[PDB]
Design a protein around this nucleic acid. Sequence first.
RNA 1: AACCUGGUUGAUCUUGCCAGUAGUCAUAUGCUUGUCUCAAAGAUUAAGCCAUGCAAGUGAAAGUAUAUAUAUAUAUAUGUAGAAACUGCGAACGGCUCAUUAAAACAGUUAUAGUCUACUUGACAUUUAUAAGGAUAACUACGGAAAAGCUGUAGCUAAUACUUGCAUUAUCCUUUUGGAUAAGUAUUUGUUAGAAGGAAUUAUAACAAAGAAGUAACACGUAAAGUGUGUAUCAAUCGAGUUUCUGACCUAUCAGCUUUUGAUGUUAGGGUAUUGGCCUAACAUGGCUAUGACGGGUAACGGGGAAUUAGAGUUCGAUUCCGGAGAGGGAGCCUGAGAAAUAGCUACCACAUCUAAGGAAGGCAGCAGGCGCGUAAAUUACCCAAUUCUAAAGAAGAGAGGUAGUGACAAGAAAUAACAAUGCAAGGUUUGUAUUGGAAUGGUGGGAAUUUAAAACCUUCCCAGAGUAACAAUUGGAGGGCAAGUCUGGUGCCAGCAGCCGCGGUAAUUCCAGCUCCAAUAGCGUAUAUUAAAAUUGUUGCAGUUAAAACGCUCGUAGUUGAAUUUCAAAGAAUCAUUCUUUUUAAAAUCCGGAUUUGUUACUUUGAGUAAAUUAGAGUGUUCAAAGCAAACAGUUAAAGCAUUGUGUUUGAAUACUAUAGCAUGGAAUAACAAAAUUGAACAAGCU
RNA 2: CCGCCCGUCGCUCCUACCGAUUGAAAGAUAUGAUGAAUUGUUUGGACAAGAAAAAUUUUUUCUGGAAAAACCGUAAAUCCUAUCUUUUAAAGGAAGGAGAAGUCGUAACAAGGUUUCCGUAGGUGAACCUGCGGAAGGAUCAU
Lengths: 257, 185, 172
Amino acid sequence: GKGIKKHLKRVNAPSHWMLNKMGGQYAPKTSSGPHKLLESIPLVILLRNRLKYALTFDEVKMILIQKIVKVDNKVRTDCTFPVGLMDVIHITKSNEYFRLLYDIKGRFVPHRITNEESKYKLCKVKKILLRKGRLSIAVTHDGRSIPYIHPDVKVNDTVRLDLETGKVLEHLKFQVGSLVMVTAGHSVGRVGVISSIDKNMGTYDIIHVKDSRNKVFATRLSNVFVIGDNTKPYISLPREKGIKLDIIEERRNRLKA
Amino acid sequence: PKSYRNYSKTARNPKRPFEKERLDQELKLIGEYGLKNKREIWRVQYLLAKIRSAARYLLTLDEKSSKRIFQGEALLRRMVRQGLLGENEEKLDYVLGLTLPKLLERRLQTKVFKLGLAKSVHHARVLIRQRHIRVGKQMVDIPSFLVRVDSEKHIDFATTSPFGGARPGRVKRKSLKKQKEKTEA
Amino acid sequence: RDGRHKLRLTGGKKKIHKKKRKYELGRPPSNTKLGSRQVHVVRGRGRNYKYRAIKLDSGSFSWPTFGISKNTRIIDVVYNASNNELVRTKTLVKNCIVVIDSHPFTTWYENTFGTTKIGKSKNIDPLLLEQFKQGRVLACISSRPGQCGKADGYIIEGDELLFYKRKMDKRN
RNA sequence: AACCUGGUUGAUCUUGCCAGUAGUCAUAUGCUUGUCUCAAAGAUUAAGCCAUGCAAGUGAAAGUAUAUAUAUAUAUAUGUAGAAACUGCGAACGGCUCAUUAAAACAGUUAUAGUCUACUUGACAUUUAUAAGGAUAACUACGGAAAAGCUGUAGCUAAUACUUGCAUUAUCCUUUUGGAUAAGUAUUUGUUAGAAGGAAUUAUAACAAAGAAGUAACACGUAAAGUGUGUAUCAAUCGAGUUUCUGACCUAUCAGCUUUUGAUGUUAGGGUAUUGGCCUAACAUGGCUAUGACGGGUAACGGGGAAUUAGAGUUCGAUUCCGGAGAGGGAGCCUGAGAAAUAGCUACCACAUCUAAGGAAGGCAGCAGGCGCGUAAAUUACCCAAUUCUAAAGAAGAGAGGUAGUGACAAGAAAUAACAAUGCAAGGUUUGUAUUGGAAUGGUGGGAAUUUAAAACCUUCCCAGAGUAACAAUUGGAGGGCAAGUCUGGUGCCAGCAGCCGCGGUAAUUCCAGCUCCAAUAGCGUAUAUUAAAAUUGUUGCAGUUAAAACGCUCGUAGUUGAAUUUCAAAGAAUCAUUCUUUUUAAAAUCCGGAUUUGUUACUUUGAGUAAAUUAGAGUGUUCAAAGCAAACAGUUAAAGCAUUGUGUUUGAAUACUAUAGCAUGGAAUAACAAAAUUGAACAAGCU
RNA sequence: CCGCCCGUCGCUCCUACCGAUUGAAAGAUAUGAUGAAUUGUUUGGACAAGAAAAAUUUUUUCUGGAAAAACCGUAAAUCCUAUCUUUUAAAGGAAGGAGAAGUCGUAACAAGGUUUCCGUAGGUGAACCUGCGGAAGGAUCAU
Ligand SMILES: [Mg+2]
Ligand SMILES: [Mg+2]
Ligand SMILES: [Mg+2]
Ligand SMILES: [Mg+2]
Ligand SMILES: [Mg+2]
Ligand SMILES: [Mg+2]
Ligand SMILES: [Mg+2]
Ligand SMILES: [Mg+2]
Ligand SMILES: [Mg+2]
Ligand SMILES: [Mg+2]
Ligand SMILES: [Mg+2]
Ligand SMILES: [Mg+2]
Ligand SMILES: [Mg+2]
Ligand SMILES: [Mg+2]
Ligand SMILES: [Mg+2]
Ligand SMILES: [Mg+2]
Ligand SMILES: [Mg+2]
Ligand SMILES: [Mg+2]
Ligand SMILES: [Mg+2]
Ligand SMILES: [Mg+2]
Ligand SMILES: [Mg+2]
Ligand SMILES: [Mg+2]
Ligand SMILES: [Mg+2]
Ligand SMILES: [Mg+2]
Ligand SMILES: [Mg+2]
Ligand SMILES: [Mg+2]
Ligand SMILES: [Mg+2]
Ligand SMILES: [Mg+2]
Ligand SMILES: [Mg+2]
Ligand SMILES: [Mg+2]
Ligand SMILES: [Mg+2]
Ligand SMILES: [Mg+2]
Ligand SMILES: [Mg+2]
Ligand SMILES: [Mg+2]
Ligand SMILES: [Mg+2]
Ligand SMILES: [Mg+2]
Ligand SMILES: [Mg+2]
Ligand SMILES: [Mg+2]
């Protein structure tokens, strides 16, 4: 007939799933949801390939059936629910809290995290709609609509967003020296300060992001996620702290162990 | 669908199949290091050749080009591990200077022959195939096996051999014993 | 039917290699007329219903000067910059000039101030006034009745009105 | 491994082909084959035809059960199952094939300010009620038809089927209380007003008119008051449609095409989900083309890629992924969020099955399987265990998928002995090779351990278990090319061989044999194609007096190519004459005497952004290796760590390749082009 | 040089061409005719639910609605041409290549016994001959 595609082939699966070529013909195909399949990750993968709590899809399903895994604090029983960049996972029985982050490679790690910090999540606004009764609503990368957002919030900036209640805490403008994480090409794990934004007329607004080794790298503004003010990040970053080393340096590090 | 389990040719053929000198050389190599075909030689050439090619490529790049330093260094390290170079000759110009003897030396059978164990190369090979020999815990019954210098010292008769302490345990010796017993009784 | 099957600008035959994909839908024209109201529903793409008016009369007509609107029977079609056939057949489309039963506007005016929210000061044209005197006034249609299912329109004014009169002009 | 040998001659040097030579994820076929791993396989011919079986269903709190069964608690109460059917969701995915199709599709690159978008997520609503209206299935009874996934009648009865249909918020006065005015979500029209985006007829707000659909007459019993089902708009998402730019093979023995039949445009409409000659009407006379239009051919689906290459390249790409298309051939619809669906329907054509001859159903380019075609291709196997999908979503299904079977397609590893005595041999005492004879071991046979959904293999152990180690290696050669016989017989310009040159006319180193040798060896030949060899298509990189080849000559359009010229230079510090760095030498605008911008494009440099699989490549003893994407570490079971008795720990699955176009970007050279005098612009004053 | 060899003429084999035959065949478009099915609209109105009257029947109005029909519009298919492409037959004709020690000459290679060769025209069993103007690839680098 011809409509949408329900299946995903295991080689056509996006690399940072890190699936096998063997070990299956297909991949899980993230449900539609709050994240873009190419930059998400289904819950199945998390449960089975990352934490390794499950050996199989079946086990994951079973786990889900006990209403014990929460993603952003409300439960999910959909095995192929997409988790995505910043989202806190609360596996209830272990009393583990994860937050998904990026590695210095493209790969999702589940970070491990405290009760206290778990209660919020960072969310970058994308669009800021006006709706009926001249009320503004931000729309986050979490595919979530924040209504009655504080007026000073502008199109690219992140927002520290509470989970227990839908309301926001604080917001961090997209400034010239704002601690930033990346979430797309090459420099994906990378975490920097920002030197400069280009602001091209018709095109993508390219930005340059100085690291803490002072290695500058550029990136589209699209795929940059504000994470702090110049001093401190508002989230716990992984062990590497977004310092994508050179290849040689990495090898040296590996050797020294 | 097709499987994704990709596979690769390990050995290229000659080109000129009845060149005399080359043939003679091959034969000599076979003689010295107890090899079954020209195929083995070809395989080893291929192995060598890839490395050589890599080295050549690296040399085309300048020093302190990232690629050259990283990949080249890695190659060098690998060579060292393999027992191709060691202390004196670890500079990437040297990995070109490898020949076939250097590689054949590190075959398991050759190593076995060297380190006592068997009277010959052929003998060593048969020993290896006949499930004796071990290279650090693990038994190994392929003579090709390129021993790395890390696991050169840890080569001897396996735990479970007749002449590594685990009963005569043969069709032969056991049978003989049985016969003797019968004779006695 | 919205698709290819057409020469290539260089005038080369596009050799067709594709049936007709339903999303290239060219469902046929509702020649919507005068009469008592009668409208069908055609089911466009994602259950997006659209209202094929096939007979009409009582469209919403606006009076732009004063920026108001009223529902009136429309009594005749008199011009169609597409083609005269349509006007002959009395078919309503999105730029048909038609005649409104124009008592309502007059009534409204009377109610508000005088006799033939309020930024009044403009106070009417001569031609328009004359038209009103006979009861019946020229007015564009502005909805696409065939899609929307309403003959919504507006009263034709000043320069445009004059032009349309000229077009109409009788003469021989 | 950036490679060449034989063949024109009496000999020679060339040109030049032929021949050899190697490879092919490249088919066939011949002979041969003991292990193991891995695994392509009715593409090529006929997108030819198909018997039978199967390939999409779905119910584990949660629409509908007096079919029905059943267990508790006191004839009722709860309950627990539940065939059937209605409803819902799915069946638009997947799978197959490659016929079409050559600026089409596809790839990258935009665009959607020109749209649609079910499920999923998050926001979140507007003009009788202690609960409404019928009418329908299964079912009961009566039927019909040879037959069909045929249905007739009558009678019931549900539903989350179908259909009705019940305060508060914002604007103004008073001290949180009491009044006044309003009060429709999309959508559409007219009138205006205008936190983003480069840009708005955008969001939005108001006014005047219409206006759908909706806002629970639903179902569980849950959580620490919750959920399921449904629902208006918005956003997200899974996408889709269109769309920009750039990019393709052969053919000029295809040069003019397109336009009544929309060709090119403008206007108005119709239509669409939206843009659009997409369609209609009216009006222009355009549009494409030697930078190849338009035809023709393709034994053409495109791409990721494959083979082969030193480097260029050449060929291939039906075929693991992405995209397109198609379900015998066209065409047409219904349903639905999504189909112009084909295990949906209508029709015709072409095939074809049953029929009691009235009718009826049917579509393997799903999986097997069969006939046909053919040089050319496997089982009517077992299972949902893994991977996934669908469902009322652990619990069911799935020929999707996996597992075996056949399998010398390929690919990897690897047996067919080894060793020691004398005997014999040769060498300057040691290697080599005929008798013996104890060790070794797979194979093969049978048990287990394991493996597995269940088996089978793998590995593992234990019994069996080699001397002609009959557990028997072949294939093709021995004139040259080309490694190896002027060994023995047979044939006698016959038979034959011989890719090529040649051999054979009774000494054949070439036939037919035997023996011996050589190569590659569980493989080795033959054929056709292809790459390299081919600098024999030549960009790198050919040749043109005489070898093939300078147009008879000149002019000439496109094409290609185009003199020099415009800021040259200078000084200081480090290093082993050179390298890398700092500073200034004019003019204009900008900033509080100091400090900082200055043609366009090519080109180049950095980026950005790209699927993986393949490729290169890092790591990793799959026993090695082909692989794979895993792993390593500590322990007869605990220390050590770190956590406030409990908890293994370290990690890895890099990186580069992703055009020739597009995006941003540093640029001094080299190129273009633009700026520039029968006159061109720069200031200061004055006048408007 | 008793070398080499050229062409016709016979004979056998194979290849492709021309070929009357409106040759044939399949396929492809293009036109036209008829035109199944069918979206849409229009007409219809078997009937199923209302309203009007009498004691279940009568007459009239409003709703939804099947068949059937008409008109555009998609448009299969069939037939007729036309054109093109592709294989394919054919008496005869006329080439080519191969073969066989066949016929006739001697064209060319030597000053090849008329130097050769070019273009052109005519001739002739056949090689060829001749005319005109060229060339040396001449048998002359020379008065
Ligand atoms: Mg289709
Ligand atoms: Mg053993
Ligand atoms: Mg050849
Ligand atoms: Mg075995
Ligand atoms: Mg076929
Ligand atoms: Mg196939
Ligand atoms: Mg359930
Ligand atoms: Mg049921
Ligand atoms: Mg599909
Ligand atoms: Mg309903
Ligand atoms: Mg027209
Ligand atoms: Mg084709
Ligand atoms: Mg392909
Ligand atoms: Mg084909
Ligand atoms: Mg078929
Ligand atoms: Mg169809
Ligand atoms: Mg089928
Ligand atoms: Mg059919
Ligand atoms: Mg089949
Ligand atoms: Mg085969
Ligand atoms: Mg399963
Ligand atoms: Mg299958
Ligand atoms: Mg030789
Ligand atoms: Mg041969
Ligand atoms: Mg002889
Ligand atoms: Mg012989
Ligand atoms: Mg070639
Ligand atoms: Mg070459
Ligand atoms: Mg040449
Ligand atoms: Mg010549
Ligand atoms: Mg000339
Ligand atoms: Mg010119
Ligand atoms: Mg120049
Ligand atoms: Mg003379
Ligand atoms: Mg003569
Ligand atoms: Mg003569
Ligand atoms: Mg004469
Ligand atoms: Mg004469």
